Write an enzyme that holds these catalytic residues in place. Structure first.
Site, PDB file in Angstrom:
ATOM      1  N   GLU A 140      -0.630 103.356 -51.368  1.00 22.83           N
ATOM      2  CA  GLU A 140      -1.301 104.113 -52.442  1.00 22.83           C
ATOM      3  C   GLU A 140      -0.302 105.020 -53.176  1.00 22.83           C
ATOM      4  N   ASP A 181      -8.135 101.732 -54.803  1.00 18.43           N
ATOM      5  CA  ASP A 181      -9.096 100.896 -55.513  1.00 18.43           C
ATOM      6  C   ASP A 181      -9.565 101.566 -56.789  1.00 18.43           C
ATOM      7  N   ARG A 186      -6.343  98.853 -60.821  1.00 16.93           N
ATOM      8  CA  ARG A 186      -6.258  97.888 -59.709  1.00 16.93           C
ATOM      9  C   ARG A 186      -5.820  96.493 -60.175  1.00 16.93           C
ATOM     10  N   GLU A 239      -8.002  99.104 -45.332  1.00 14.74           N
ATOM     11  CA  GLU A 239      -8.997 100.070 -44.841  1.00 14.74           C
ATOM     12  C   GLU A 239     -10.361  99.641 -45.370  1.00 14.74           C
ATOM     13  N   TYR A 271     -11.583 101.971 -40.984  1.00  9.74           N
ATOM     14  CA  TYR A 271     -10.947 103.296 -40.955  1.00  9.74           C
ATOM     15  C   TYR A 271     -11.898 104.345 -40.375  1.00  9.74           C
TER      16      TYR A 271
HETATM   17  O1  LIG Z   1       4.411 119.342 -56.504  1.00  4.63           O
HETATM   18  C1  LIG Z   1       5.816 119.492 -56.240  1.00  4.63           C
HETATM   19  C2  LIG Z   1       6.044 119.456 -54.732  1.00  4.63           C
HETATM   20  O2  LIG Z   1       6.001 118.071 -54.325  1.00  4.63           O
HETATM   21  C3  LIG Z   1       6.358 117.829 -52.963  1.00  4.63           C
HETATM   22  O3  LIG Z   1       6.317 116.417 -52.773  1.00  4.63           O
HETATM   23  C4  LIG Z   1       5.010 115.864 -52.515  1.00  4.63           C
HETATM   24  C5  LIG Z   1       5.425 114.653 -51.725  1.00  4.63           C
HETATM   25  O4  LIG Z   1       5.848 115.078 -50.452  1.00  4.63           O
HETATM   26  C6  LIG Z   1       4.240 113.728 -51.547  1.00  4.63           C
HETATM   27  O5  LIG Z   1       4.686 112.580 -50.849  1.00  4.63           O
HETATM   28  C7  LIG Z   1       3.576 111.710 -50.535  1.00  4.63           C
HETATM   29  C8  LIG Z   1       3.627 111.454 -49.021  1.00  4.63           C
HETATM   30  O6  LIG Z   1       3.331 112.657 -48.310  1.00  4.63           O
HETATM   31  C9  LIG Z   1       2.624 110.350 -48.649  1.00  4.63           C
HETATM   32  O7  LIG Z   1       2.773 110.021 -47.265  1.00  4.63           O
HETATM   33  C10 LIG Z   1       1.834 109.046 -46.832  1.00  4.63           C
HETATM   34  C11 LIG Z   1       0.652 109.740 -46.134  1.00  4.63           C
HETATM   35  O8  LIG Z   1      -0.134 110.480 -47.105  1.00  4.63           O
HETATM   36  C12 LIG Z   1      -0.192 108.617 -45.484  1.00  4.63           C
HETATM   37  O9  LIG Z   1      -1.260 109.255 -44.769  1.00  4.63           O
HETATM   38  C13 LIG Z   1      -2.278 108.318 -44.338  1.00  4.63           C
HETATM   39  C14 LIG Z   1      -3.463 108.361 -45.319  1.00  4.63           C
HETATM   40  O10 LIG Z   1      -3.081 107.725 -46.568  1.00  4.63           O
HETATM   41  C15 LIG Z   1      -4.667 107.618 -44.709  1.00  4.63           C
HETATM   42  O11 LIG Z   1      -5.814 107.856 -45.528  1.00  4.63           O
HETATM   43  O12 LIG Z   1      -4.935 108.131 -43.355  1.00  4.63           O
HETATM   44  C16 LIG Z   1      -3.836 107.875 -42.455  1.00  4.63           C
HETATM   45  C17 LIG Z   1      -4.321 108.229 -41.019  1.00  4.63           C
HETATM   46  O13 LIG Z   1      -4.819 109.573 -41.059  1.00  4.63           O
HETATM   47  C18 LIG Z   1      -2.681 108.769 -42.937  1.00  4.63           C
HETATM   48  O14 LIG Z   1      -1.540 108.686 -42.047  1.00  4.63           O
HETATM   49  O15 LIG Z   1       0.628 107.874 -44.545  1.00  4.63           O
HETATM   50  C19 LIG Z   1       1.635 107.106 -45.229  1.00  4.63           C
HETATM   51  C20 LIG Z   1       2.338 106.238 -44.158  1.00  4.63           C
HETATM   52  O16 LIG Z   1       2.860 107.094 -43.126  1.00  4.63           O
HETATM   53  C21 LIG Z   1       2.619 108.128 -45.869  1.00  4.63           C
HETATM   54  O17 LIG Z   1       3.592 107.386 -46.567  1.00  4.63           O
HETATM   55  O18 LIG Z   1       3.016 109.171 -49.345  1.00  4.63           O
HETATM   56  C22 LIG Z   1       2.806 109.311 -50.766  1.00  4.63           C
HETATM   57  C23 LIG Z   1       2.987 107.947 -51.466  1.00  4.63           C
HETATM   58  O19 LIG Z   1       4.211 107.307 -51.111  1.00  4.63           O
HETATM   59  C24 LIG Z   1       3.776 110.415 -51.289  1.00  4.63           C
HETATM   60  O20 LIG Z   1       3.630 110.612 -52.716  1.00  4.63           O
HETATM   61  O21 LIG Z   1       3.720 113.333 -52.835  1.00  4.63           O
HETATM   62  C25 LIG Z   1       3.169 114.396 -53.537  1.00  4.63           C
HETATM   63  C26 LIG Z   1       2.610 113.818 -54.852  1.00  4.63           C
HETATM   64  O22 LIG Z   1       1.397 113.087 -54.607  1.00  4.63           O
HETATM   65  C27 LIG Z   1       4.305 115.413 -53.815  1.00  4.63           C
HETATM   66  O23 LIG Z   1       3.738 116.562 -54.448  1.00  4.63           O
HETATM   67  C28 LIG Z   1       7.799 118.249 -52.748  1.00  4.63           C
HETATM   68  O24 LIG Z   1       8.127 117.999 -51.385  1.00  4.63           O
HETATM   69  C29 LIG Z   1       7.981 119.733 -53.047  1.00  4.63           C
HETATM   70  O25 LIG Z   1       9.391 120.012 -53.040  1.00  4.63           O
HETATM   71  C30 LIG Z   1       7.413 120.100 -54.427  1.00  4.63           C
HETATM   72  O26 LIG Z   1       7.268 121.524 -54.511  1.00  4.63           O
HETATM   73  O1  LIG Z   2     -10.220 110.605 -53.353  1.00  2.00           O
HETATM   74  C1  LIG Z   2      -8.983 110.261 -52.729  1.00  2.00           C
HETATM   75  C2  LIG Z   2      -9.133 108.933 -51.992  1.00  2.00           C
HETATM   76  O2  LIG Z   2      -9.043 107.926 -53.021  1.00  2.00           O
HETATM   77  C3  LIG Z   2      -9.189 106.550 -52.588  1.00  2.00           C
HETATM   78  O3  LIG Z   2      -9.141 105.724 -53.847  1.00  2.00           O
HETATM   79  C4  LIG Z   2     -10.350 105.814 -54.632  1.00  2.00           C
HETATM   80  C5  LIG Z   2     -11.143 104.483 -54.571  1.00  2.00           C
HETATM   81  O4  LIG Z   2     -11.578 104.211 -53.235  1.00  2.00           O
HETATM   82  C6  LIG Z   2     -12.370 104.545 -55.480  1.00  2.00           C
HETATM   83  O5  LIG Z   2     -12.956 103.253 -55.508  1.00  2.00           O
HETATM   84  C7  LIG Z   2     -14.231 103.189 -56.168  1.00  2.00           C
HETATM   85  C8  LIG Z   2     -15.367 103.124 -55.149  1.00  2.00           C
HETATM   86  O6  LIG Z   2     -15.543 104.402 -54.518  1.00  2.00           O
HETATM   87  C9  LIG Z   2     -16.708 102.773 -55.830  1.00  2.00           C
HETATM   88  O7  LIG Z   2     -17.677 102.579 -54.794  1.00  2.00           O
HETATM   89  C10 LIG Z   2     -19.050 102.649 -55.241  1.00  2.00           C
HETATM   90  C11 LIG Z   2     -19.795 103.216 -54.045  1.00  2.00           C
HETATM   91  O8  LIG Z   2     -19.323 104.557 -53.792  1.00  2.00           O
HETATM   92  C12 LIG Z   2     -21.294 103.213 -54.350  1.00  2.00           C
HETATM   93  O9  LIG Z   2     -22.002 103.725 -53.213  1.00  2.00           O
HETATM   94  C13 LIG Z   2     -23.413 103.879 -53.509  1.00  2.00           C
HETATM   95  C14 LIG Z   2     -23.693 105.313 -53.869  1.00  2.00           C
HETATM   96  O10 LIG Z   2     -23.062 105.650 -55.120  1.00  2.00           O
HETATM   97  C15 LIG Z   2     -25.201 105.539 -54.027  1.00  2.00           C
HETATM   98  O11 LIG Z   2     -25.382 106.931 -54.257  1.00  2.00           O
HETATM   99  O12 LIG Z   2     -25.923 105.129 -52.831  1.00  2.00           O
HETATM  100  C16 LIG Z   2     -25.706 103.743 -52.445  1.00  2.00           C
HETATM  101  C17 LIG Z   2     -26.523 103.496 -51.180  1.00  2.00           C
HETATM  102  O13 LIG Z   2     -26.016 104.289 -50.099  1.00  2.00           O
HETATM  103  C18 LIG Z   2     -24.202 103.497 -52.255  1.00  2.00           C
HETATM  104  O14 LIG Z   2     -23.915 102.108 -51.879  1.00  2.00           O
HETATM  105  O15 LIG Z   2     -21.743 101.863 -54.640  1.00  2.00           O
HETATM  106  C19 LIG Z   2     -21.163 101.374 -55.845  1.00  2.00           C
HETATM  107  C20 LIG Z   2     -21.771 100.012 -56.130  1.00  2.00           C
HETATM  108  O16 LIG Z   2     -23.183 100.153 -56.321  1.00  2.00           O
HETATM  109  C21 LIG Z   2     -19.655 101.283 -55.669  1.00  2.00           C
HETATM  110  O17 LIG Z   2     -19.171 100.917 -56.948  1.00  2.00           O
HETATM  111  O18 LIG Z   2     -16.595 101.558 -56.641  1.00  2.00           O
HETATM  112  C22 LIG Z   2     -15.594 101.659 -57.679  1.00  2.00           C
HETATM  113  C23 LIG Z   2     -15.620 100.409 -58.596  1.00  2.00           C
HETATM  114  O19 LIG Z   2     -15.318  99.246 -57.811  1.00  2.00           O
HETATM  115  C24 LIG Z   2     -14.213 101.895 -56.996  1.00  2.00           C
HETATM  116  O20 LIG Z   2     -13.124 101.973 -57.906  1.00  2.00           O
HETATM  117  O21 LIG Z   2     -11.971 104.865 -56.817  1.00  2.00           O
HETATM  118  C25 LIG Z   2     -11.329 106.153 -56.915  1.00  2.00           C
HETATM  119  C26 LIG Z   2     -11.037 106.416 -58.394  1.00  2.00           C
HETATM  120  O22 LIG Z   2     -12.256 106.268 -59.119  1.00  2.00           O
HETATM  121  C27 LIG Z   2     -10.028 106.123 -56.112  1.00  2.00           C
HETATM  122  O23 LIG Z   2      -9.342 107.390 -56.234  1.00  2.00           O
HETATM  123  C28 LIG Z   2      -8.066 106.257 -51.594  1.00  2.00           C
HETATM  124  O24 LIG Z   2      -8.188 104.997 -50.846  1.00  2.00           O
HETATM  125  C29 LIG Z   2      -8.028 107.362 -50.476  1.00  2.00           C
HETATM  126  O25 LIG Z   2      -6.881 107.167 -49.592  1.00  2.00           O
HETATM  127  C30 LIG Z   2      -7.951 108.777 -51.055  1.00  2.00           C
HETATM  128  O26 LIG Z   2      -8.029 109.697 -49.973  1.00  2.00           O
END
Ligand SMILES: OC[C@H]1O[C@@H](O[C@@H]2[C@@H](O)[C@H](O[C@@H]3[C@@H](O)[C@H](O[C@@H]4[C@@H](O)[C@H](O[C@@H]5[C@@H](O)[C@H](O)O[C@H](CO)[C@H]5O)O[C@H](CO)[C@H]4O)O[C@H](CO)[C@H]3O)O[C@H](CO)[C@H]2O)[C@H](O)[C@@H](O)[C@@H]1O
Ligand SMILES: OC[C@H]1O[C@@H](O[C@@H]2[C@@H](O)[C@H](O[C@@H]3[C@@H](O)[C@H](O[C@@H]4[C@@H](O)[C@H](O[C@@H]5[C@@H](O)[C@H](O)O[C@H](CO)[C@H]5O)O[C@H](CO)[C@H]4O)O[C@H](CO)[C@H]3O)O[C@H](CO)[C@H]2O)[C@H](O)[C@@H](O)[C@@H]1O
Length: 436
Positions: A140, A181, A186, A239, A271
């Protein structure tokens, strides 16, 4: 012994058991602890600690998973006990190469020696295991229309990880990508990761469209399936498990492994295993460090038990690059031109020859502002939008800063060993005086 887990290989857009030739479907769960600083890793590596993995494997066996997704390992620690124990229960691992403190920064992306070394260390730590299913080269990274320019860095990482594996003695474990997503990005992301000369080996989507008692049609799974029909690499849900309705019935699992989806998708991973006060767990670890099964656990168990995907064998399966999406400002900004492979030897020359250095031992962004207003920092800039990457843009952040510091020193020309930045982390490199 790894008998129960023969290596999985990729043929076209499907996974196959390399011994039997049967299609392999992922029935998985994410498995990653988190801490609720200078002395321990920020992440927890459950696969490095037998008392943890051996506790949980019996419960994982009960769920009926054959795959875990692990997001962070510590490459300095042994993993053979946990990997052997997983293998003995028929379980595989999908593993991210990055960790929270060493990842491609989606807002300020770089593909450099520091991140590349992290990737190589994980590869060298984990590649001896036949049950290592695949590596993710990013998760992501681009996540909406505002940071699409991070994707070329991810593609460079895919290229370089695959080449590092290819040139090593290891089994050629595939390297893929895991995406979110966002409806606006996407399509372009999926195309980008299979366009041009560098491709992901597989593609996982973090898929939360199906919430509560949804259906194949209304959830969106039907449309997602139609759009990935014929996609050239294996695709799966890295996931799933929207928690909007609880206990999660996980009825999406019936759809995922049903006849219509099983022809397109290679399965998915729920997940996740551990409850972290985010209400996504199927178990909670108690104060006694024991496992308390949560209401979701039985539903996931029942749904996986019922799941019986009808696939196709390797032999029956067996019986012109794609255009990269065009650039549009504010919409899609991932250049086809990728940053170069980070060159540790070139960058290490900076450590040896530069008169002024900054040790790795808030500061950085401020120091760039200052230095880059005095000297030309083009040679360390990396632009994923225009595909223009400076000559030293692959070096570590400290090497890049030291280069600019030293240019300022030479420009001044006092030659008095006073590096033109009063700061404890700055020093004059005495080796720079020794006559890449
Ligand atoms: O605003 C200026 C400041 O910015 C800081 O940098 C930020 C930078 O560190 C950050 O990097 C992102 C990474 O931390 C990120 O790492 C990923 C994890 O988030 C992910 O966690 C998963 C989670 O996605 C899932 O839902 O659940 C898992 C189980 O709980 C959980 O582990 O795991 C990945 C695999 O280990 C890991 O890579 O990755 C991102 C995408 O590559 C990075 O972007 O990004 C921020 C921007 O979005 C930055 O702000 C600087 O460090 C400071 O100097 C600045 O002041
Ligand atoms: O926020 C940070 C996290 O971001 C994730 O990425 C986001 C991505 O997952 C998201 O995808 C969209 C879907 O959520 C969306 O799903 C819809 C369902 O939520 C909906 O559920 C209904 C509910 O609305 C209603 O109230 O009740 C129903 C009965 O219980 C229930 O089913 O159903 C919809 C279909 O009817 C369904 O569409 O669908 C979208 C279109 O496909 C998806 O795009 O989108 C976000 C941006 O908009 C993304 O940021 C990351 O994976 C995480 O790691 C981050 O933590």
């Amino acid at each position: 012994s790894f008998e129960k887990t023969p290596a999985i290989k990729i043929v076209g857009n499907k996974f196959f058991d390399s011994e039997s030739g049967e299609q392999f479907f992922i029935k998985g769960i994410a498995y990653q602890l988190q801490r609720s600083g200078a002395f321990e890793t920020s992440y927890i590596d459950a696969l490095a600690d037998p008392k943890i993995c051996l506790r949980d494997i019996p419960f994982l066996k009960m769920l009926g998973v054959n795959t875990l997704r692990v997001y962070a390992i510590d490459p300095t620690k042994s993993h053979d006990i946990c990997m052997e124990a997983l293998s003995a229960e028929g379980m595989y691992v999908l593993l991210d190469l990055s960790e929270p403190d060493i990842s491609i920064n989606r807002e300020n992306p770089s593909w450099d020696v520091h991140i590349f070394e992290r990737y190589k260390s994980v590869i060298d730590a984990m590649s001896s295991f036949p049950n290592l299913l695949g590596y993710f080269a990013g998760n992501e990274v681009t996540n909406d229309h505002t940071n699409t320019f991070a994707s070329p860095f991810v593609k460079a990482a895919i290229r370089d990880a695959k080449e590092y594996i290819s040139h090593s003695n290891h089994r050629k474990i595939p390297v893929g990508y895991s995406t979110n997503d966002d409806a606006m990005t996407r399509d372009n992301l999926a195309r980008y990761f299979v366009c041009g000369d560098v491709k992901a080996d597989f593609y996982g989507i973090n898929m939360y469209e199906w919430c509560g008692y949804s259906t194949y049609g209304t959830s969106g799974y039907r449309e997602r399936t139609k759009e990935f029909e014929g996609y050239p690499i294996p695709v799966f849900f890295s996931e799933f498990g929207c928690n909007l309705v609880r206990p999660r019935p996980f009825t999406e699992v019936s759809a995922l492994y049903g006849n219509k989806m099983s022809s397109v998708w290679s399965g998915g991973l729920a997940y996740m295993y551990f409850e972290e006060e985010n209400e996504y767990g199927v178990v909670k670890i108690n104060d006694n460090d024991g496992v308390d099964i949560l209401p979701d656990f039985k539903n996931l168990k029942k749904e996986f038990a019922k799941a019986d995907p009808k696939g196709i064998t390797e032999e029956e399966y067996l019986t012109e690059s794609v255009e990269c999406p065009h650039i549009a400002v504010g919409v899609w900004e991932a250049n086809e031109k990728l940053p170069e492979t980070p060159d540790r030897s070139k960058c290490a020359c900076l450590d040896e020859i530069l008169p002024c250095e900054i040790v790795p031992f808030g500061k950085y962004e401020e120091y760039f502002s200052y230095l880059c207003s005095k000297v030309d920092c083009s040679d360390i800039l990396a632009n994923g939008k225009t595909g223009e990457y400076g000559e030293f843009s692959d070096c570590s952040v400290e090497q890049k800063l030291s280069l600019q510091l030293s240019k300022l020193y030479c420009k001044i020309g006092a030659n008095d060993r006073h590096c033109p930045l009063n700061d404890k982390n700055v020093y004059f490199n005495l080796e720079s005086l020794q006559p890449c």
